[PDB]
Amino acid sequence: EACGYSDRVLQLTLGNSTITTQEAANSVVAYGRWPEYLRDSEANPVDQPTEPDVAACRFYTLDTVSWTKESRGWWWKLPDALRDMGLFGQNMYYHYLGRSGYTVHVQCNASKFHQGALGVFAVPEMCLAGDSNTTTMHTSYQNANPGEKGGTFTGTFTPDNNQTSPARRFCPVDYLLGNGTLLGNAFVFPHQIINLRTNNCATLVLPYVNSLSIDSMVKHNNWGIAILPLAPLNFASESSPEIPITLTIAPMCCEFNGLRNITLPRLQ
Amino acid sequence: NTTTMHTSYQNANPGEKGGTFTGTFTPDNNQTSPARRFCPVDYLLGNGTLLGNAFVFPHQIINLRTNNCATLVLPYVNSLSIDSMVKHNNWGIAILPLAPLNFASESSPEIPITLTIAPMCCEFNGLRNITLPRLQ
Amino acid sequence: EACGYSDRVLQLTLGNSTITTQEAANSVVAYGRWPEYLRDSEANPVDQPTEPDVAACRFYTLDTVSWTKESRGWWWKLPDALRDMGLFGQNMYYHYLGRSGYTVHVQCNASKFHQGALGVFAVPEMCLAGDSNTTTMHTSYQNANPGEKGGTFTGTFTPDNNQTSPARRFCPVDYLLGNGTLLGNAFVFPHQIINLRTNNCATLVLPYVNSLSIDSMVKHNNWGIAILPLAPLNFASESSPEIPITLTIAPMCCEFNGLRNITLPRLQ
Amino acid sequence: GAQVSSQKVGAHESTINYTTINYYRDSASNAASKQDFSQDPSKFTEPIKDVLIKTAPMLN
Amino acid sequence: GAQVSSQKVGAHESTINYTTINYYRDSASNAASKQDFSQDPSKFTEPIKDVLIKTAPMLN
Amino acid sequence: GSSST
Amino acid sequence: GSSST
Amino acid sequence: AATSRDALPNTEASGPTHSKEIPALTAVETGATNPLVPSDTVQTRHVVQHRSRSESSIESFFARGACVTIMTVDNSASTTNKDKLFAVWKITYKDTVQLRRKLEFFTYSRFDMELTFVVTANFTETNNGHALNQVYQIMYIPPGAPVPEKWDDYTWQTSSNPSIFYTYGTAPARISVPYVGISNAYSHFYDGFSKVPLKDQSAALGDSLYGAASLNDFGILAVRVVNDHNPTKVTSKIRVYLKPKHIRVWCPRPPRAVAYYGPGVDYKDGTLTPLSTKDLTTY
Amino acid sequence: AATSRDALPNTEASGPTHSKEIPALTAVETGATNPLVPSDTVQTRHVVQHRSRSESSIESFFARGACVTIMTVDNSASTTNKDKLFAVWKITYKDTVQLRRKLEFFTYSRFDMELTFVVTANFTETNNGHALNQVYQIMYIPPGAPVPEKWDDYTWQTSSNPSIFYTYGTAPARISVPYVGISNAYSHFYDGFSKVPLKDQSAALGDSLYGAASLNDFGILAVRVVNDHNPTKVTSKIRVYLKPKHIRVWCPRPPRAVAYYGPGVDYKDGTLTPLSTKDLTTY
Amino acid sequence: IDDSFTEGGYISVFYQTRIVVPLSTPREMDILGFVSACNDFSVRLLRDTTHIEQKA
Ligand SMILES: CCCCCCCCCCCCC/C=C\[C@H](O)[C@H](N)CO
Ligand SMILES: CCCCCCCCCCCCC/C=C\[C@H](O)[C@H](N)CO
Ligand SMILES: *C(=O)CCCCCCCCCCCCC
Ligand SMILES: *C(=O)CCCCCCCCCCCCC
């Protein structure tokens, strides 16, 4: 626009929180669907829902991770990554059922002399593969659900051989997208790329997606966020460059059904 | 009786257990480490005014021959539209035996009292990190 | 504009002079008032005014100063800084009375690898403090009026102790804006900032401001220009960076009353 | 020559009014009316030549 | 700006009136009118949810 | 002028 | 007579 | 539209009764007071009631000036171990008891404040030496403004604080103040604290007085004799009278039954027996 | 047409946002302040705003009398080495500091001046001998009129100068003065000199004070006790209070941050550190 | 004035990611901060300041 408006410069405001960016590459709305509340014609639990509105639909910033030449990739699950985030987490553990959409904003700036590219993928039902070749489907709840720290990808499959006390964790191999399918095809999932010469962030607006209108947020993750270095970090001639990656995520249109006492999960 | 307005936050705020009234004023004399709690005398309504006049406050009486409950619907009342719930209490619930418990000829009768309370039309402003109060 | 017009790219033309800039941060019109000639309803001396128009209302460039890591700041007074500038100065010293507005254009370019920020303030009646703690209001005419060289600010008040032959000059301390008030508040005066990453110039259009419609230009200065490093100069890792600062100023709508022989002031 | 104006009534017990009569020829002798006007801060807060649209980039 | 109101005449010697003029801009400076209203005690004397009919059993 | 209550 | 503001 | 000076309801004549209508039977458990009138339980005549409740309207009940403090000042030569006496008072209605008790029939109030100042002076020492007529300065120092440390320091310039220069022997001084509360009403009772004690904080650091809200609720009056000192000593007292004009009140309370013991609702041992002996069946 | 006592704008309710509109990003280099309101960066509710800026209008900000000087006079027998004391004061607001600081938030002003005079007297010596009620003459001597050399000389006739004969113990005296400036506004700051030093002239001859314009800007007040002297000595002080009524101001300035040091903008060594220690990351 | 009952809360600034510079660039820099009132801002009860005095 002749009054300055740009595809690269955005402001997002949800609740008492604002994000600004001056180097965006537009933003994505997954499958073209904006988040919505559950409609009466698709409703299922009959009790009055709880809708925390601004108390939970606001931007929460997770722990910042670090991108280096040796980084193979990072992953998070939703709602799991937000389980300890203010009143969203509270509302989640007090109710049997919950549904929510999200604005996911991945942040990573550098300089005109750095280079590298992160593929940021939002995957519905991001089932990841386990570490065992003696057993299948055995990743424990605790290891499946890292909370805000997320997990990481590896370039090597390495099977857990301790049969006495199995690790029971995922072993998500990067070129296999951690699930036995080729990473080059992950672009059919809603995504953006942070290519440092072009942009310093990715913004994905995710609808609630599920085979049900509402479900157990504590038992089930609807979305997975996978971030992988499509082109590796590089800077000047430094052998060991580093730049930070920060995730800020906001729940949108979340509602909860089936209120009782609070869930106290076994997380370790 | 050596200090005024000195009941601590912790003792002022018992949470759900509440506190009790006493028939006797008994002054805290440990000046080294003061109790810092209330000493609410029943016939003085715990505040220096006569209990017989407490009926000007919104009330009901549970007289066992007549009824087994009291129901009070309370509006938000304050000199402000909204305030710090953690610093300030808007309402006090005081329950006192106007006529004492008695049963048949038992020397030691007992009956339970249960409080069930529901918030109504509550709204909150000024969201941040959670308050973690010093309660003990 | 879709035909290229930018807030950052300007051309100013007064008389036979043009200034171009490609890195402006818009321009300021002090108190929203553009310069004007004296109106009949506010007039006071009754003789026909002299209005030199393009002969004096043109851009004059003062001596360039140098900004370094040790620079505390610079100041100038108007009309004093222009007293020897072509026919403006001539018209000024031939008449008892004179009034004038100004376009002030401060120039300072560097590089995308330099950093620093100059606050450029136009102050109406910029009275500065003296060097003495035995006497007040004793700065001499000569020291009050440096002409185009201007004066400078200091980070330290240092009292003149020679009582036999007092220096009789100002001792303008930078964080006190040279006048006993805090520099952080100088932004209530009409101003711009030259922040080297953003812009390479400041442009202030100043109306004639005074408690009179017209006055003695030789006895009285209407405006003060104060330039102070809000954030210090820095470049790469050089210990001793330097970049130049140039002032170009144009009188606007100036008129003079009370013509006689020329004033020959004692300036040294 | 009486001037009748309204009070802005703060704590309350229609418009309440008050009366004023000037007793002297010189306006300097008069009390202050306190019937003052406000103005926009712009000449100090937005003294720029090109009007600022706050949703737009300030620099373009 | 004069305000004319009636007195409630107690001992007697038509309506007798009295006059009031406010001399100041601030309503706080004004005297008290004493022209006050009354209200029903109900919010304190009958604060019950279901209206009480006094000839009827209070409990039914 | 005059109010009459 | 009277002004009314 | 019913006014405070309107007459109360007429007694309507009423005759004998024999019905299922039971006005006299009721049930105070409900929390209600039985709205009866004499014709509900006895036979009445018609009476045209002239009486009104005019003098017990909230305004009329409070429409009096009450003494809230006495301030002492002198006009003596300041000398190395003792200075000329000026007085400082934190504005409150709780230093005396009568207005406090009346206000405390209610939980919250709004009103304009009328302050009247009665000033009296006397000689304290025997010398027949005289004094000339004193002028007093009553300065209102709102919370935040500099409090005077000396009878003659810079704060008595009052460029912004309101001051009254009162001349001795003239009419008692008087000013009005609007409702100046920072809340929508004045709180006669505040069941709370001005600080939340946090766990991650020391107890000392989270501590505050029970029932106190702003420390300096309304500020200070500072009073001085403006005159320089005489050879003879004169002491003066400034009695402050408070009247609440244009007043509104909310939430009624039982009145104070035992002696006040400080600014809070606290009571002292030994003062807790307001009621006297009287036998149940003795008129 | 917007008045000082009008309520400020309502907060309009506003929801979530995701657009190219960037209120929060700006550029202070331009010299402008970003005109934001809470609904620009957070979600808001609708609020009906009742608050007004009435008390901070220029008039309301200045609508107070401030002490600008104290004049001392006596009523003593004039004797060969010392005469009866009358006082002389050059009118100014710069002898005290509080009104000066308020006026100096601005470069120029116009106003009508209200001068109120508070007068106080006392005995200075021990004798029990008395004095009768004093009348004071406050004469305004405009620049050019003859200044009194003696408490009783011809100038106190005042055929043309305005005088106030004040009676002791009566209400404080008060007069008003129009805007009397010789310019279109009063200059709180004058960056200049009253003389141009010419080269063909000696330095002494072209010299003048920095920042001073007319030497006797506004003239003098001369005050005397009109009474003849008593056997006993009485000293009096006349405190002068200045209020700017009907005021207008131009060109705002940062307020005085370090102690005043004379009538100019000069500052003293040792007074230049107004700010106190506080750590960057300490609340 | 500082008063617990009318306390306003906390302003703070943090690094979201980090400042990144290329080579040949200063690794340290300043930010400056400014405060101003919005259009809904007002004050009342005039009083003398403590920011100026006149000892003697
Ligand atoms: C020159 C004299 C000026 C006097 C100015 C006094 C201004 C302060 C008015 C104070 C208002 C006090 C109101 C009474 C107390 C409060 O109701 C309760 N303690 C709770 O807020
Ligand atoms: C019988 C009493 C008569 C008193 C008459 C006083 C007349 C003089 C009024 C003086 C006006 C003083 C205005 C204040 C100062 C100036 O603003 C600045 N220093 C610059 O012009
Ligand atoms: C306009 O003023 C016409 C009405 C007159 C009303 C009564 C005036 C009250 C006394 C004023 C005396 C004159 C003061 C110099
Ligand atoms: C309305 O008031 C119009 C009639 C005026 C009647 C005479 C007023 C009496 C004097 C009041 C003086 C003003 C007080 C500030």
3-state secondary structure A95-135: EEEEEEEEEEEEECCCCCCEEEEEEEEEEECCCCCECCCCC
Ligand 2 site, residue I187, Cβ cutoff 6 A? yes
Instruction: Please choose, from the candidates A78, A128, A67, the residue with its C-alpha nearest in 3D space to the C-alpha of residue A102.
Output: A78
Taking the C-alpha atoms of residue H211 and residue H208, their distance in angstroms, rounded to an integer, is 9
Taking the C-alpha atoms of residue C100 and residue C255, their distance in angstroms, rounded to an integer, is 7
Instruction: Please choose, from the candidates A198, A246, A245, the residue with its C-alpha nearest in 3D space to the C-alpha of residue A67.
Output: A245
- What is residue H176's DSSP assignment? E
Q: Where are the alpha helices (DSSP H) in chain B?
A: 9-12
* CB-based touch I/F (3+ pairs, under 8 A): no
Taking the C-alpha atoms of residue A241 and residue A238, their distance in angstroms, rounded to an integer, is 6
Q: Cis (ω within 30 of 0) for the bond into B75?
A: no
Ligand 2 site, residue I177, Cβ cutoff 6 A? yes
Chains touching chain D at 3 or more Cβ pairs under 8 angstroms?
A, C, E, G, H, I
Taking the C-alpha atoms of residue A244 and residue A64, their distance in angstroms, rounded to an integer, is 7
Per-position b or e across B112-131, b if 16+ CB within 10 A of its CB: eeeeeeeeeeeeeeeeeeee
Residue I8 near chain J (CB below 8 Å): yes
- What is residue A47's DSSP assignment? S
Residues contacting residue E30 through CB under 8 Å, at least 6 positions apart: D7, D16, E22, E24, H245, H246
CA quadruple C28, C33, C37, C43: dihedral, nearest 10:
-150
B84 is written with which tokens? 């710090």
Instruction: Please choose, from the candidates F5, H180, H21, C219, the residue with its C-alpha nearest in 3D space to the C-alpha of residue E7.
Output: F5
Q: How many CA atoms lie within 13 A of A224 on its CB side?
A: 23
H178 is written with which tokens? 């609007």
Give the three-state DSSP class for H102. Answer: helix
Q: How far apart are the first and last CA of chain C?
A: 52
Per-position b or e across E32-57, b if 16+ CB within 10 A of its CB: bebebebeeeeeeebbeeeebebeee
What pairs with residue C119 in β-bridges? C193, C228
Answer for the pair C203, C27: CB distance below 8 angstroms, yes or no. yes
Taking only residues 243 to 272 of chain H, the set having a beta carbon closer than 8 angstroms to any beta carbon of chain B reads 251-258, 260-269, 272
User: CB-CB: which of A109, A236, A245 is closest to J20?
Assistant: A109
Answer for the pair C206, C122: CB distance below 8 angstroms, yes or no. yes
Phi-psi region of H20 (alpha: psi -120 to 50; beta: other; left: phi over 0): alpha
- What is residue J32's DSSP assignment? -
Q: Which atom from ligand 2 is nearest to the alpha carbon of I219?
A: 8
Q: CB distance B49–H257 less than 8 Å?
A: yes
Q: CB distance G2–D4 less than 8 Å?
A: yes
- Give Rg (Cα) of chain B: 18
Taking the C-alpha atoms of residue E8 and residue E16, their distance in angstroms, rounded to an integer, is 8
Tell me the ligand closest to D23's alpha carbon. 3
3-state secondary structure chain C: CCCCCCCCCEEEEECCEEEEECCCCCCEEHHHCCCCCCCCCCCCCCCCCECCHHHCCCCEECCCEEEECCCCCEEEEECHHHCCCHHHHHHHHHEEEEEEEEEEEEECCCCCCEEEEEEEEEEECCCCCECCCCCCCCCCHHHHCCHHHCEECECCCCCCCCCCCCCCCECCEHHHCCCCECHHHHHHCCEEEEECCCCCEEEEEECCCCCCCCECCCCECCEEEEEEEEEEEEECCCCCCEEEEEEEEEEEEEEEEEECCCCCECCC
Q: How many CA atoms lie within 13 A of C41 on its CB side?
A: 0
Distance I242 CA to ligand 2 centre (A): 9
The CATH number of residue H147's host domain is 2.60.120.20
Instruction: Please choose, from the candidates H262, H265, H243, the residue with its C-alpha nearest in 3D space to the C-alpha of residue H253.
Output: H265
What pairs with residue B31 in β-bridges? none
What distance lies between CA A214 and its chain's CA centroid?
A: 19
Q: Tell me the nearest-neighbour CA distance from A130 into chain B, angstroms.
A: 36
Answer for the pair I176, I112: CB distance below 8 angstroms, yes or no. yes
Residues contacting residue H50 through CB under 8 Å, at least 6 positions apart: H7
The CATH number of residue D38's host domain is 4.10.80.10
Q: Tell me the nearest-neighbour CA distance from C241 into chain I, angstroms.
A: 22
Q: Is the dihedral of CA H238, H243, H244, H250 positive or negative?
A: positive
Q: Where are the alpha helices (DSSP H) in chain D?
A: 42-45
Q: Is the dihedral of CA B2, B5, B10, B13 positive or negative?
A: positive
What pairs with residue I244 in β-bridges? I113
Residue C250 near chain D (CB below 8 Å): no
J5 is written with which tokens? 């009952």
Residue H180 near chain J (CB below 8 Å): yes
What distance lies between CA C213 and its chain's CA centroid?
A: 20
Pairing of strands D2-6, G2-4: parallel
Cβ burial, residue H48 (10 Å; 0-12/13-18/19+): exposed
H228 is written with which tokens? 């320089």
Taking the C-alpha atoms of residue J8 and residue C127, their distance in angstroms, rounded to an integer, is 38
Taking the C-alpha atoms of residue I167 and residue I156, their distance in angstroms, rounded to an integer, is 17
Ligand 1 site, residue H140, Cβ cutoff 6 A? yes
Q: Hey, of A109, A248, A249, which one would you mutate to test binding to chain J, going by the most J CBs within 10 A of its CB?
A: A109
Pairing of strands C223-235, C114-124: antiparallel
Q: Is the dihedral of CA C47, C51, C56, C57 positive or negative?
A: positive
Phi, psi of A206 (to 5 degrees): -105, 125
Closest E-chain CA to H36: E54
Answer for the pair I196, C263: CB distance below 8 angstroms, yes or no. yes
Tell me the ligand closest to H216's alpha carbon. 1
What is the CB neighbour count within 10 angstroms for residue D28?
18
Answer for the pair B81, H184: CB distance below 8 angstroms, yes or no. yes
What is the CB neighbour count within 10 angstroms for residue I218?
18
Phi, psi of C186 (to 5 degrees): -60, -20
Taking the C-alpha atoms of residue I96 and residue I68, their distance in angstroms, rounded to an integer, is 5
Instruction: Please choose, from the candidates B51, B80, B58, B79, the residue with its C-alpha nearest in 3D space to the C-alpha of residue H249.
Output: B79
Could you tell me the CA-to-CA distances from I112 to A23, A191, H196, I60, I247 in Å, in that order?
Answer: 58, 71, 51, 14, 7
Tally the domains of chain I.
1
Its domain, for residue I232, covers 1-283
Give the three-state DSSP class for H43. Answer: coil
Cβ burial, residue C24 (10 Å; 0-12/13-18/19+): buried
Q: CB distance I128–H133 less than 8 Å?
A: no
Could you tell me the CA-to-CA distances from D22 to A76, C38, D37, F2, I173 in Å, in that order?
Answer: 79, 36, 22, 19, 19
Q: Which atom from ligand 3 is nearest to the alpha carbon of D24?
A: 15
Could you tell me the CA-to-CA distances from I159 to B114, I87, I155, I163 in Å, in that order?
Answer: 93, 20, 9, 9
Give the three-state DSSP class for H16. Answer: coil
Closest I-chain CA to A16: I42
CATH of domain A1-268: 2.60.120.20
Taking the C-alpha atoms of residue A208 and residue A252, their distance in angstroms, rounded to an integer, is 9
Q: Which helix (H) or strand (E) holds A87?
A: helix A86-94
Closest J-chain CA to B83: J5
DSSP string covering chain I: --BTTSBPPPBPPB--EEES--TT---GGGSPPP---GGGTS-B--B----B-GGGSHHHHH-S-EEEEEEEEE----BTTB----EEEE--S-SSSHHHHHHTTEEEEEEEEEEEEEEEEEE-S------PPPEEEEEEE-TTSPPPSSTTSGGGG-SSS-EEEEETTSS-EEEEE----SSSSEES---B-SSPPBTTS-HHHH---TT--STTSS-EEEEEE-SPPPSS-EEEEEEEEEEEEEEEEEEE-PPB-S---SSSS---TT----PPP--TT--
Q: Which helix (H) or strand (E) holds A242?
A: strand A242-259
Q: Whose CA is nearest to atom 9 of ligand 2?
A: I218
What pairs with residue I125 in β-bridges? none
- What is residue B83's DSSP assignment? -
Instruction: Please choose, from the candidates C89, C91, C90, C65, the residue with its C-alpha nearest in 3D space to the C-alpha of residue C78.
Output: C89
Q: Whose CA is nearest to atom 11 of ligand 1?
A: H218
Could you tell me the CA-to-CA distances from C227 to C118, C143, C156, I75, I190 in Å, in that order?
Answer: 6, 19, 17, 57, 21
Residues of chain A whose C-beta is under 8 A from some C-beta in I? 1, 5-7, 9-18, 20, 22, 27, 54, 57, 103, 205, 252
Instruction: Please choose, from the candidates A237, A225, A261, the residue with its C-alpha nearest in 3D space to the C-alpha of residue A80.
Output: A225
Taking the C-alpha atoms of residue B43 and residue B47, their distance in angstroms, rounded to an integer, is 9
Given the structure tokens 């997606």, which residue do they identify? A209
Q: Cis (ω within 30 of 0) for the bond into B40?
A: no
Cβ burial, residue C131 (10 Å; 0-12/13-18/19+): buried
I231 is written with which tokens? 């056997």
Resolution stated for this PDB structure, in Å: 2.9
What is the CB neighbour count within 10 angstroms for residue B40?
16
Query: Edge-to-edge, what's the strand order for the sheet holding I17-19?
Result: A17-21, A10-14, I17-19
Taking the C-alpha atoms of residue C72 and residue C78, their distance in angstroms, rounded to an integer, is 21
Q: Is the dihedral of CA C233, C237, C240, C246 positive or negative?
A: negative
Give the three-state DSSP class for A152. Answer: strand
User: CB-CB: which of I4, I33, I34 is closest to D36?
Assistant: I4
Its domain, for residue D8, covers 1-60
Answer for the pair I111, I249: CB distance below 8 angstroms, yes or no. no
Q: Tell me the nearest-neighbour CA distance from A112 into chain D, angstroms.
A: 21
Instruction: Please choose, from the candidates H151, H157, H160, I259, the residue with its C-alpha nearest in 3D space to the C-alpha of residue J49.
Output: H160
C243 is written with which tokens? 């970049």
Given the structure tokens 């950093």, which residue do they identify? C115
Answer for the pair H115, H240: CB distance below 8 angstroms, yes or no. yes
What pairs with residue A12 in β-bridges? A19, I18
I252 is written with which tokens? 């705002």
Given the structure tokens 């006050």, which residue do they identify? E36
Tell me the ligand closest to D17's alpha carbon. 4
Residues contacting residue H223 through CB under 8 Å, at least 6 positions apart: H71, H73, H86, H87, H88, H89, H136, H137, H138, H139, H238
Taking the C-alpha atoms of residue A247 and residue A65, their distance in angstroms, rounded to an integer, is 9
Instruction: Please choose, from the candidates I261, I252, I274, I266, the residue with its C-alpha nearest in 3D space to the C-alpha of residue I104.
Output: I252
Instruction: Please choose, from the candidates I217, I213, I194, I215, the residue with its C-alpha nearest in 3D space to the C-alpha of residue C141.
Output: I194
Ligand 1 site, residue H180, Cβ cutoff 6 A? yes
I119 is written with which tokens? 């007068």
I258 is written with which tokens? 């370090």
Give the three-state DSSP class for H24. Answer: coil
Taking the C-alpha atoms of residue C240 and residue C229, their distance in angstroms, rounded to an integer, is 16
Residue D15 near chain G (CB below 8 Å): no
What is the CB neighbour count within 10 angstroms for residue H272?
16
Answer for the pair A160, A191: CB distance below 8 angstroms, yes or no. no
Taking the C-alpha atoms of residue I254 and residue C188, their distance in angstroms, rounded to an integer, is 7
What is the CB neighbour count within 10 angstroms for residue A8?
16
Longest CA–CA span in chain G (Å) reads 14
Instruction: Please choose, from the candidates I264, I213, I220, the residue with its C-alpha nearest in 3D space to the C-alpha of residue I240.
Output: I220
Give the three-state DSSP class for D35. Answer: coil
Distance H218 CA to ligand 1 centre (A): 5
Q: Which helix (H) or strand (E) holds H61?
A: helix H58-62
Tally the domains of chain E.
1
Could you tell me the CA-to-CA distances from A32 to A27, A139, A212, C240, G3 in Å, in that order?
Answer: 11, 33, 19, 56, 67
Q: CB distance A15–B124 less than 8 Å?
A: no
H129 is written with which tokens? 């030496």
Q: Which residues of I touch D58 (CB under 8 A)?
A: 25-27, 30, 32, 34
Residues contacting residue A124 through CB under 8 Å, at least 6 positions apart: A189, A209, A210, A222, A223
Q: CB distance J10–I283 less than 8 Å?
A: yes
Q: CB distance C28–D43 less than 8 Å?
A: no
Residues in chain F: 5
Residues contacting residue I54 through CB under 8 Å, at least 6 positions apart: D8, I4, I5, I60, J44
What distance lies between CA C215 and its chain's CA centroid?
A: 18
Distance I181 CA to ligand 2 centre (A): 8
Q: CB distance H22–E8 less than 8 Å?
A: no
Ligand 1 site, residue H220, Cβ cutoff 6 A? no
Q: Which residues of D touch E36 (CB under 8 A)?
A: 13
- In single-letter form, the type of residue at position I88 comes to V
Residues flanking ligand 4, CB < 6 Å: D 2, 4, 19-21; E 1-2, 21, 23; F 1; G 2
I24 is written with which tokens? 């929060």
Answer for the pair A105, A256: CB distance below 8 angstroms, yes or no. no
Give the three-state DSSP class for B56. Answer: helix
Distance C108 CA to ligand 4 centre (A): 66
A41 is written with which tokens? 């014609």
Cβ burial, residue B23 (10 Å; 0-12/13-18/19+): exposed
Taking the C-alpha atoms of residue I145 and residue H127, their distance in angstroms, rounded to an integer, is 47
Beta strands in A125-211 (DSSP E): 151-152, 191-195, 201-206
Q: CB distance I42–A15 less than 8 Å?
A: yes
Cβ burial, residue A94 (10 Å; 0-12/13-18/19+): middle
Taking the C-alpha atoms of residue C14 and residue C203, their distance in angstroms, rounded to an integer, is 14
Instruction: Please choose, from the candidates A28, A86, A58, the residue with its C-alpha nearest in 3D space to the C-alpha of residue A202.
Output: A28
